[PDB]
Design a protein around this ligand. Structure first.
Ligand SMILES: OC[C@H]1O[C@@](CO)(O[C@H]2O[C@H](CO)[C@@H](O)[C@H](O)[C@H]2O)[C@@H](O)[C@@H]1O
Ligand SMILES: [Cl-]
Ligand SMILES: [Cl-]
Ligand SMILES: [Cl-]
Length: 129
């Protein structure tokens, strides 16, 4: 599915992402916008043979297992196919591990380049929450 901006903000808040490990809700909504354009089925292949899956473009070399990526670590212990669900539970649970294991939200290239440093509060402005 394709989430609306405030629709995804509400769902991400219900799943505990607001201020998680120091990142306000707008960071996560902005991340999803530029990672997947709010599409839960987005997938993209990378130069290292890995693939990014889903609303938060979770990677098959480190985080989820897609059975075709050498050196797979599967640190989220989840098949990548589960991350293409319209329900964001598995993606959020894995994202909490990613942002806890390394350098914050910098793992997400699109967030790093196109969200970090801007006023991310604008991404939840006007939403019901
Ligand atoms: O995720 C660990 C590590 O991998 C890098 C390498 O570019 O990012 C990959 O994983 C991200 C999270 O799933 C993806 O969003 C990204 O597209 C993918 O390249 C590093 O940024 C990150 O620290
Ligand atoms: Cl915010
Ligand atoms: Cl854009
Ligand atoms: Cl603005």
């Amino acid at each position: 599915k394709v989430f609306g901006r405030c629709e995804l903000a509400a769902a991400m808040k219900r799943h505990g992402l607001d201020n998680y490990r120091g990142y306000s809700l707008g960071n996560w909504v902005c991340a999803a916008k530029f990672e997947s354009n709010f599409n839960t089925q987005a997938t993209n292949r990378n130069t290292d043979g890995s693939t990014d899956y889903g609303i938060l473009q979770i990677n098959s070399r480190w985080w989820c297992n897609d059975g075709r990526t050498p050196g797979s670590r599967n640190l989220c212990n989840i098949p990548c196919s589960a991350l293409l669900s319209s329900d964001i539970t598995a993606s959020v649970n894995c994202a909490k591990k990613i942002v806890s294991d390394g350098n914050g939200m910098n793992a997400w290239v699109a967030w790093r380049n196109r969200c970090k440093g801007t006023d991310v509060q604008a991404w939840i402005r006007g939403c019901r929450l």
